[PDB]
Amino acid sequence: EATRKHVQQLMKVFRAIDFDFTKKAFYLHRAKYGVQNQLRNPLYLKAMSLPRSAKLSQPCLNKMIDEVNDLESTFYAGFSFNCHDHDQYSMDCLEAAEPTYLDGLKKLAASTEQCLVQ
Amino acid sequence: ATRKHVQQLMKVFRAIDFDFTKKAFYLHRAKYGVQNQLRNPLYLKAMSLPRSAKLSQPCLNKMIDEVNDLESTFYAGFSFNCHDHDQYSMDCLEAAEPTYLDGLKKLAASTEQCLVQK
């Protein structure tokens, strides 16, 4: 029996939902590699060029972690429900929210560098 | 020479990595939620329709919107609306996921009553 037209229309709606989940997984991937590139890697540089007798400020690592969380929450809000004038999870929402997030991690990597030793 | 500070920084960035993996596991659970409670039942419902049956597009749109609202609410329950446990734990997951599954199975039934345009 030929594939019913309405089966194809039903599956069309579910394709777009599956793709919605894909777009969300792309968001996560960008957010993770944002952290690696703007934050982890430059701070790995600072750590290796340090005197054997240096103590690390864990209040500073604590501020960084919670500041990672707030930047990432704000990135997901920009990608999703807080996208000022775009479809739900578009690439156009990412284009607006990602630079803010990466510039946030960049600034955070600088202030973390400054409080790292003590 | 200074293996100590580097290992100490990796510990913090290891955890952020795993946090991203917990968020990806959430997303897979939400995906297989839609497949099991919504997609698979609605496909059976459709193959039992008369072959001529035409679908109601407004019904399908109500279904996509409600999937996003339900998943928006699941993720909130996974994070900032958890309160009683830490921000992306399995505990937060296990508390909010039945409500999400229950909501999808409800939407599987409300969509069935409107699926055919008669």
Author numbering:
A (entry chain A): 2 to 119
B (entry chain B): 3 to 120
What did the paper state?
To combat these defenses, Anopheles mosquitoes produce inhibitors belonging to the SG7 protein family that block complement at the alternative C3 convertase, C3bBb. Crystal structures of albicin and SG7.AF reveal a novel four-helix bundle arrangement that is stabilized by an N-terminal hydrogen bonding network. In this study, we describe the structures of albicin and its orthologs SG7.AF (from An. freeborni) and anophensin (from An. stephensi), characterize the binding and mechanism of AP inhibition by these inhibitors, and determine a role for properdin in modulating the inhibitory activity of SG7.AF. SG7 family members are quite similar to one another structurally, but amino acid sequence divergence suggests that specific side chain interactions are key determinants for the observed differences in target affinity.
Anophensin, the albicin ortholog from An. stephensi, has been shown to inhibit the contact pathway of coagulation through binding with factor XIIa and high-molecular-weight kininogen (29). We evaluated the AP inhibitory activity of recombinant anophensin in the erythrocyte lysis assay and found it to be much less potent than albicin or SG7.AF with an IC50 value of approximately 350 nM in NHS and 6 μM in PDS. We obtained crystals of a variant of anophensin containing three additional amino acids at its N-terminus. This variant exhibits a reduced retention volume in gel filtration chromatography suggesting oligomerization. The structure was then determined experimentally using a selenomethionine derivative and found to be significantly rearranged in that helix α1 is moved away from the rest of the helical bundle and forms part of a single extended alpha helical structure running from the N-terminus to the C-terminal end of α2. This presumably occurs due to loss of the stabilizing effect of the N-terminal hydrogen bonding network described above as a result of lengthening of the peptide and changing the position of the free N-terminal amino group. In the crystal, anophensin occurs as a symmetrical dimer in a domain-swapped arrangement where a number of the amino acid interactions in albicin between α1 and the rest of the bundle are retained but are now intermolecular. The extended coil region linking α1 and α2 also becomes helical, creating several new intermolecular interactions that may stabilize a dimeric form of the protein in solution. Dimerization in solution may account for the decreased gel filtration retention volume and reduced activity of this variant. Nevertheless, the anophensin structure with its extended N-terminus suggests that the α1-α2 region of the 30 kDa family might be unable to form the N-terminal hydrogen bonding network seen in albicin and SG7.AF and possibly assume a partially unfolded structure that could be relevant for the interaction with collagen.
